Each structure stands twice: as C-alpha cells, then as structure tokens.
Amino acid sequence: GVHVLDRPIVLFTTTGAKSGKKRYVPLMRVEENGKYAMVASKGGDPKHPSWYFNVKANPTVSVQDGDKVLPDRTARELEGEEREHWWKLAVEAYPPYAEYQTKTDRLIPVFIVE
C-alpha cells in the first residue's frame, strides 16, 4: 500500500513469478542518471537475501524514490567492469557494503534497474 520513501532508501517492488504476489524490498539508494542498483547482500550474512532468486525469476521490478515511481523496469544482474562501477557507487553510498564483501570471496550480486 502506501510507502513513504526518503533518501537514503528506495523501494523496489517485486512480483512473484508463480503467484503474482507483490513483495516490497527497501534497499539503500544507489542511483546514477536515472538507473538504480539493488545490492543483494544480506546484512553481512553471506547467504542470499530472499529476493535475489525472485528478481532473477521475474526481472520486472518497480522503483519508488521519494515521490517518484518508475513502474515495471527491468532488473539485470551486473557483471564485469559494469558491476565494478555500480559497486563503487554502492560503497560510496553505504560503506559497510565493503565490509560485507570481505566476509566472502564470492562477489555480492548487484542488479541494475533500468
């Protein structure tokens, strides 16, 4: 229902691939030129957050940033240099993300929402 969002957080709305159920995933705001990143950490626990598999099963994801709603955009798991770029923006936004990363050799997934 109605969410109230302010920096430093944004809301990503996911839709169940099997059920159609909406789930609401607040994450740190990591933004550039109208695109957003979803950093798939889990608070320093190295296992995946429960939404990770959901955005891969159904990449259609809405964003709410302040009063602005970007409906039914597409989440794409980043690779390579592009992941690195968005990782840098994430660590500037929320430095403990880098601390989360020191707890595993596997790169924390980052999705671009576009």
What resolution in angstroms does the PDB record give? 1.5
For the chain, the first-to-last Cα distance in angstroms comes to: 23
Distance separating alpha carbons of residues 23 and 106, to the nearest angstrom: 26
Closest-CA residue to 30 (of 79, 97, 76, 106): 97
Experimental technique: X-ray
Q: Domain segments of the chain: what residues?
A: 1-114
1-114, which class in CATH?
A: mainly beta
Type and span of the H or E element at 98: helix 96-102
Distance separating alpha carbons of residues 36 and 30, to the nearest angstrom: 6
Residue 111 near residue 38, CB atoms below 8 Å: yes
Distance separating alpha carbons of residues 103 and 114, to the nearest angstrom: 29
